[PDB]
Symmetry: C2
Subunit: 155 residues, 2 copies
């Protein structure tokens, strides 16, 4: 039979210039602090064009933990980032696309995820879509707050 793939599309404006928002959000070493969702973020190797890194989440409200490896390709020149899952997990596939658009007073981050769950996975498209929206919004809001706070150079 046929079915539709899943997708998430979230945005948030960070009151800081592109350079800072880009540098912070792409500083993998800081991810476990920047993202409340990530317990670990380990770069495994630099595939030249991009890199492969392992991510592991902090347990969610139910105690579930996710861990996977993804190939990430940042492209500062194009103010864009793309990545996709490479392991055999519940996701048939999962790819990401981040854009950083200049707006009055800051940078608007837009994160898009396109995926499809394997049949029988603990989470189906509907459930995972809800889970990802919740965590993504939480992550983007924490990141906004952290960046804007460090961006203040006064007292």
């Amino acid at each position: 039979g046929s079915h539709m793939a899943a997708r998430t599309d979230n945005s948030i404006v960070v009151n800081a210039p592109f350079e800072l928002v880009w540098d912070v959000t792409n500083d993998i070493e800081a991810w476990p602090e920047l993202f409340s969702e990530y317990a670990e973020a380990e770069i495994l190797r630099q595939d030249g064009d991009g890199f492969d890194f392992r991510l592991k989440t902090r347990p969610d409200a139910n105690g579930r933990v996710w861990e996977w490896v993804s190939h990430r390709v940042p492209d500062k020149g194009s103010r864009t980032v793309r990545a996709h899952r490479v392991e055999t997990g519940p996701f048939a596939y999962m790819n990401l696309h981040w854009t950083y658009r200049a707006v009055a007073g800051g940078t608007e981050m837009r994160w898009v995820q396109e995926f499809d769950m394997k049949p029988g996975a603990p989470f189906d498209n509907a459930h995972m879509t809800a889970h990802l929206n919740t965590t993504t919004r939480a992550n983007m809001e924490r990141i906004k707050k952290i960046i804007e706070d460090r961006h203040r150079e006064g007292q």
Copy 2:
């Protein structure tokens, strides 16, 4: 006439492994967030063995702001970092030495600063010593808290 140079010696134990404490404290991009004292931390160039970077403080209680360039040389293999001021400012000289010692449950950071103020500088050895101790302790405590918090992988 003769006089004695100044020195500060501060320590704090961070409940995290060397790798994490080292990586975080040497991630210059994160300094404006890690250190409440730094408004900016910009790497200017990589002098091969080390690098030169510009630092600018957030105003202190009196509204005073410091900005300087220093040559920093991290040496992970030796678990040590050394740096020194290169500009013509109120400091006749200022050099730093950080050590990371393994202790039960964590890493003890020890930061030592050796310096001497130029005569006529707004701050003399005594005043600057007090200022540096206050800010250093504040910085080390914030860093301890941040690292230990991100180090927790549970809920």
